């Protein structure tokens, strides 16, 4: 009987630089107008504040999150981080971890994300000889139970290395067969000790299940740049343009700048996408340079409260503040670039850009903020007012009401 | 018996949970259980209770001047020091005593809501501001004494040798009651390192005040300038009475320059403050701390023409430092917690009355987190803030 299922009144829209009413029917934005007349079931008044599309946390580890919790001090952080140690910690952990513990962590992680207005995430999940597909199974189960809260892509993740743990290949195939959405490895050079082999193997598996690729490349300096360049060239050779993401690419921060300058056309040609996580972005990462060159660069938590990262609130607005401090940004323009990173850049990384944004016909997945603008939100860190997924209110005043 | 009791307080220095009994502005008893009941109690419920945070470097006078539009004002252009100086001279031309006092009070309220109970603010003194900003700050200070303790640095923002009115104005500012004196960039602002430093000492000594110097200059010219400062500190009988703010040069100068200078800094008792709005990612924070250097922490500017950020929140500042510096271990987060607490106290000179021990001041923050590490990680809002043994903040409202 009624003209709109939901109307958000008085919404400041950063892309249009003005205040509008937003009219929603079902899971779709139907109308954006200075003032909407018509009958409506439910309304939310944004009161002139910013309303944003849902945030995108383009790289998480939901499977092993919150494992540092339960004592006065974070567990595991009596010692400094190294990749190989954190790998051994993970193999020890998954020996006895239960399906229910892992599913609980994934749900807790998702709840924390959605409370902060993240509506889309791409999680990695550990696949190795100890975890087997136990973690994958729990993640895919949770995913299904969370589908009214948050959209999740799952990367089948060969955390130990295809050429280090030889069971990885069979187990990743199974993980893909089970329904993982992407495949990925780690450090073709310093973990695998076999750049060409590891990358070729990832493409073989990807192609078998017709999935996209998200690769963890931590390696610094010229060995990092070399490894991403090999990845990018293989992307072209395999007919995989636009289907490959490189996570981290810390090497862009310490390799000679001329190495990045030479590789940019290759990245554009291959449609290589990137993710920088705010838990590790190097201070001298050329974020603004990448963005100005037209490179797709999303943003993410990475791990939350585990034996890799003790931090994490699953909050992209807090992450955006963290980036501005890491990178030493202040201008309104630069804060605006960070805001695109946690929104529309992420959407592009995830491949959802056609249905993402506050425009007519797009999905009604939205966050009403308590701040005036992207810049003021990053600065003031005000809590979210309301979160809307599939045109239904799922968070109101710091509670999940879905 | 007790005016206030905090129940079930985790104390990080003792690594256990205690009841805390308070009479007047003093902590009187710390025991596993305090027998009996009193009118005013706060239950920490096993979470951390901390001494009040110390924001060792602010600019309360010109805070919140970027506010009032959809986008922050001023930030259509990148920062440089000399441009921010011009912005400040333009702003203070017409800024009123009441606007400035209002911003100071807003800033204080924001700080105390996050559990900061002690701050050292600089205040612009130059030919345009004159002592108008000084006046307003001292006036707000007096009105805020039940909320927060404020030290005021008479700050020659434009340079003693660039704005020649600075000297006379700073003398007046001290006469009016500023607690400290300071300048900026002896080398690249003043173009006279010996002169500027000697002048600051002359003025300091006339009014028997401490020194807090802004030294942003990077690399070897920064280290040189801090070294000249520290030598002059010894020459002037000023050991322990001088702080150097920023010292960004420690980050990019050859590490052997800092290694050579450390004994000089220890000999001179030089104190330092690194502000979480600019700490360079390669600043050798942990190195300084392990060498026993006193290194406090601070907001610097909040929402103005120098820095667009700021929530006046030292716990958020601590998280920012861990990200700038790439820290993760429980030990390192512990060190950052000392920076926002007891290191600050030592910078400000209030260490004897600072801490959660019997006989110390009942200036306390009850957190909603288990531990210093968990508080930096989870960023939970403060539950209760106590100043001079009186509850001033409860659940995000100032109730004083
Ligand atoms: Cl950048
Ligand atoms: Cl009271
Ligand atoms: Zn990761
Ligand atoms: Zn300052």
B10 near A CB under 8 A: yes
Query: Residue B207's CB: how many other CB atoms inside 10 A?
Result: 17
CB B74 within 8 A of CB A16: no
Q: What is the DSSP string of A375-386?
A: HHHHHH-PPEEE
Q: How far apart are CA B249 and CA B220, in angstroms?
A: 7
DSSP state, B82? H
Full set of structural domains in chain A with CATH: 1-54+356-402 (2.30.40.10), 55-355 (3.20.20.140)
Among A residues 197-216, those touching chain B with beta carbons less than 8 Å apart: none
Q: What is the 3-state secondary structure (H, E, C) of A23-51?
A: EEECCEEEEEECCCCCCEEEEEECCCCEE
Query: Residue B142's CB: how many other CB atoms inside 10 A?
Result: 10
CA distances to A232, A234, A268, B90 from A241, rounded to whole Å, are 9, 10, 9, 53
Q: How far apart are CA B61 and CA B65, in angstroms?
A: 9
The shortest C-alpha distance from A370 to chain B (Å) reads 13
Q: How far apart are CA B129 and CA B259, in angstroms?
A: 40
Q: Which two tokens stand for residue A265?
A: 């056309």
Q: Which two tokens stand for residue A226?
A: 């070399």
Q: How far apart are CA A295 and CA A271, in angstroms?
A: 8
Q: How far apart are CA B299 and CA B306, in angstroms?
A: 12
A95 near B CB under 8 A: no
Q: In what order do the strands lie in the sheet with A296-300?
A: A55-60, A118-126, A151-157, A182-184, A212-217, A244-248, A273-277, A296-300
Q: How far apart are CA A232 and CA A213, in angstroms?
A: 11
Q: Which are the contacts of B235, defined by CB distance < 8 A and separation ≥ 6?
A: none
B307 near A CB under 8 A: yes
Among A200, A166, A196, A195, which Cα is nearest to A183's? A200
The shortest C-alpha distance from A366 to chain B (Å) reads 20
Method: X-ray
Among B219, B220, B229, B152, which Cα is nearest to B186's? B229
Beta strands in A193-351 (DSSP E): 212-217, 244-248, 273-277, 296-300
Q: Is B146 exposed, middle or buried (0-12, 13-18, 19+ CB in 10 A)?
A: exposed
The answer on whether B40 is annotated among ligand-binding residues is no
H-helix or E-strand containing A125? Answer: strand A118-126
Query: Residue A381's CB: how many other CB atoms inside 10 A?
Result: 19
DSSP state, B194? H
Resolution stated for this PDB structure, in Å: 1.8
First to last CA, chain A: 24
Q: CB–CB of B10 and A72 under 8 A?
A: yes
Q: Which two tokens stand for residue B387?
A: 């100043």
Q: CB–CB of B324 and A372 under 8 A?
A: no
Q: Which residues of A touch B310 (CB under 8 A)?
A: 379
- Longest alpha-carbon distance in chain A: 65
Q: Which two tokens stand for residue B21?
A: 């009994």
Q: Is A179 exposed, middle or buried (0-12, 13-18, 19+ CB in 10 A)?
A: middle
Q: Is B187 exposed, middle or buried (0-12, 13-18, 19+ CB in 10 A)?
A: middle
Reduced to 3 states (helix: H, G, I; strand: E, B; else coil), residue A206 is helix
The answer on whether A302 is annotated among ligand-binding residues is yes
Q: CB–CB of B78 and A372 under 8 A?
A: no
Q: Which two tokens stand for residue B72?
A: 């922050």
Reduced to 3 states (helix: H, G, I; strand: E, B; else coil), residue A277 is strand
CB A388 within 8 A of CB A365: yes
Reduced to 3 states (helix: H, G, I; strand: E, B; else coil), residue A288 is helix
Q: CB–CB of A326 and B329 under 8 A?
A: no
Distance of CA A47 to the CA centre of its chain: 29
């Amino acid at each position: 009987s009624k003209d709109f299922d939901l109307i958000i009144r008085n919404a400041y829209l950063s892309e249009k630089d003005s205040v509008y009413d937003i009219g929603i029917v079902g899971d779709r934005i139907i109308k954006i107008e200075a003032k909407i007349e018509g009958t409506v079931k439910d309304e939310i008044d944004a009161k002139g504040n910013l309303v944003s599309p849902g945030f995108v946390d383009a790289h998480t580890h939901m499977d092993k999150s919150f494992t540092s919790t339960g004592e006065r001090l974070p567990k595991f952080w009596s010692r400094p981080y190294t990749r190989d140690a954190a790998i051994e910690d993970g193999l020890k952990y998954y020996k006895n971890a239960t399906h229910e513990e892992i599913k609980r962590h994934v749900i807790e992680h998702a709840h924390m994300q959605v409370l902060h207005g993240t509506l889309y995430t791409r999680t990695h999940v550990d696949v190795d000889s100890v975890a087997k597909t136990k973690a994958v199974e729990a993640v895919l189960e949770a995913k299904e139970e969370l589908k009214d809260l948050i959209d999740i892509q799952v990367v089948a993740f060969a955390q130990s290395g295809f050429f280090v743990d030889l069971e990885s290949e069979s187990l990743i195939r199974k993980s893909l067969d089970m329904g993982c959405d992407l495949v990925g490895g780690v450090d073709p050079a310093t973990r695998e000790n076999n750049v060409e082999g590891s990358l070729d193997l990832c493409f073989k598996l990807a192609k078998e299940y017709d999935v996209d690729i998200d690769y963890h490349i931590h390696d610094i300096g010229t060995v990092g740049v070399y490894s991403i360049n090999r990845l990018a060239q293989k992307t072209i050779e395999n007919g995989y343009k636009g289907r490959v993401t490189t996570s981290h690419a810390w090497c862009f921060a310490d390799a000679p700048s001329e190495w990045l300058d030479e590789a940019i056309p290759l990245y554009k040609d291959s449609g290589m996408k990137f993710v920088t996580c705010f838990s590790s972005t190097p201070p001298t990462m050329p974020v603004i340079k990448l963005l100005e060159a037209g490179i797709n660069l999303g943003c993410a938590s990475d791990n939350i409260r585990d034996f890799w990262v003790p931090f994490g609130n699953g909050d992209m607005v807090q992450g955006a503040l963290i980036e501005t401090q890491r990178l030493e940004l202040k201008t309104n323009r630069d804060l605006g670039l960070i805001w695109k990173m946690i929104t529309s850049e992420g959407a592009r990384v995830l491949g959802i850009e056609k249905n993402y944004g506050i425009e007519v016909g797009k999905k009604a997945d939205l966050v009403v903020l308590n701040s005036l603008s992207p810049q003021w939100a990053i600065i003031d860190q005000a809590k979210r007012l309301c979160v809307i997924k599939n045109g239904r209110i799922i968070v109101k005043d710091e509670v999940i009401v879905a």
